C-alpha cells in the first residue's frame, strides 16, 4: 500500500474494536445455537424411520406413510380385478 502508514494510521484494525468483538461473538453464538439446537429440532431426524418412534410427529408421519401404502395397494388390486372382469366380459 503506497503510503501505507499514512493510510492505516487512523484505522489499523477497527474503528470500534469492542463493537466488532461483540458482533463476532453474537454471530458465533447465534450460529452455534441455530445449528446445534434449532434447525435439528425442526428437521426432526433423530427418530426418523424409527421402528418405535417416541415422537408424535414421527408417529404421525409413519401413520401417513403406511396409510398411503395401504390405499395404493388396495386400489391397485381393485383396479386389476375390475380390468380382469371387463376383459372377461368383452369376449362374450
Amino acid at each position: 500500500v503506497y503510503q501505507g502508514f499514512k493510510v492505516l494510521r487512523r484505522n489499523p484494525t477497527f474503528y470500534n474494536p469492542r463493537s466488532a468483538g461483540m458482533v463476532a461473538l453474537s454471530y458465533f453464538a447465534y450460529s452455534y445455537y441455530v445449528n446445534k439446537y434449532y434447525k435439528p429440532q425442526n428437521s426432526n431426524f433423530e427418530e426418523y424411520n424409527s421402528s418405535h418412534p417416541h415422537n408424535h410427529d414421527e408417529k404421525v408421519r409413519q401413520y401417513h406413510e403406511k396409510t398411503n401404502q395401504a390405499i395404493r395397494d388396495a386400489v391397485l388390486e381393485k383396479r386389476a380385478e375390475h380390468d380382469q372382469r371387463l376383459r372377461e366380459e368383452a369376449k362374450l
Binding site: 371387463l86 376383459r87 366380459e89 368383452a90
Partner: protein, 109 residues
C-alpha cells in the same frame, strides 16, 4: 383448485400441445363403436382397435372429460325424454306467473 379436474387438465407441460382434430376423430370413432355396442357400462375392451387409437390420439385429461360427459349423457337419457322435458318446462314457465301460497293445516308429517 387442487381438487378441480378441469383446472388440473388445463395444466400442461411447457412444450405440450394437443392435436384436437386427430383426438376428436379418434374419440368420435370410439364413441360410435360404443354406442353401437349400446351397453349400460362402457366396456372399452369390446372395441380394442378404436380404443387403442383413442388412447393414442387423445390426452388423459381430454379422455377424462369425455368419459364424464358420456356418463352424464347416459344418466340424462335414462332419466328424461325430449317431449317430457319440453312439457315440464312449459308447465313450470306457466306456473311461474302465478304465486305459491302456503298450504295451511296440512295432513302429512
Amino acid at each position: 383448485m387442487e381438487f378441480s379436474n378441469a383446472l388440473l387438465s388445463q395444466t400442461k407441460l411447457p412444450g405440450q400441445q394437443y392435436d384436437y382434430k386427430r383426438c376428436f376423430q379418434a374419440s368420435n370413432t370410439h364413441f360410435e363403436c360404443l354406442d353401437s355396442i349400446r351397453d349400460a357400462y362402457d366396456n372399452h375392451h369390446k372395441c380394442p382397435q378404436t380404443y387403442q387409437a383413442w388412447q393414442s390420439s387423445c390426452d388423459v385429461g381430454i379422455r377424462r372429460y369425455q368419459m364424464d360427459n358420456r356418463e352424464q349423457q347416459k344418466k340424462d337419457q335414462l332419466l328424461y325424454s325430449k317431449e317430457q322435458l319440453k312439457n315440464y318446462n312449459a308447465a313450470k314457465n306457466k306456473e311461474a306467473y302465478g304465486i305459491t301460497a302456503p298450504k295451511n293445516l296440512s295432513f302429512a308429517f
